[PDB]
Amino acid sequence: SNAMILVPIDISDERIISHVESEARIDDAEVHFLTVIPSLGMDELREGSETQLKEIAKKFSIPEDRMHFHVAEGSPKDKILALAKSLPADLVIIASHRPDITTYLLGSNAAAVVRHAECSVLVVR
């Protein structure tokens, strides 16, 4: 039962990198990157999303054999929470909001994950 850290990533559009790396180093945790394709060809979108997720993950200094990639479809908050439950995650690491939006001190997904996760949550600023 290695530690498992869930790292949701919005692939649309760096402070989380040092935090994920440091948290992973604590236990040599498994690091599960997740991207959610919002609802409303699917196999093609999933494939392109996985490729972009992997591109982003190259920025992180984590061993290859510790990184796992997930693509979900639907509500980002619902899927982040579902995966934190099913892994189960020992930690969720999430940015407080998108870097280019300051109106809200916590974004919606961050606020929901912080409140509803069954595990600890690190909100990164």
Q: Which residues bind ligand ADP (CB under 6 A)?
A: 8-10, 34-36, 76, 80, 94-95, 97-98, 101, 107-110
17-36 residues near a second copy, rule: CB under 8 A:
none
Nearest-CB residue for ligand ADP? 107
Contact 58, 67 (CB under 8 A): no
Q: Pseudo-torsion of CA 50, 114, 24, 100, nearest 10°?
A: 60
Q: Which of 33, 77, 30, 79 lies closest to 56 in space, CA to CA? A: 33
Q: How far apart are CB 3 and ligand ADP at their closest, in Å? A: 19
Contact 109, 81 (CB under 8 A): no
Residue in 13, 14, 41, 103 binding a second copy, rule: CB under 8 A? 41
Q: Which stretch binds a second copy (CB under 8 A): 19-27, 41-49, 100-108, 113-121?
A: 41-49
Four-residue CA torsion sign, 43, 71, 16, 57: negative
Task: Please state the residue numbers annotated as binding site for ATP.
Answer: 8, 10, 36, 98, 108-110
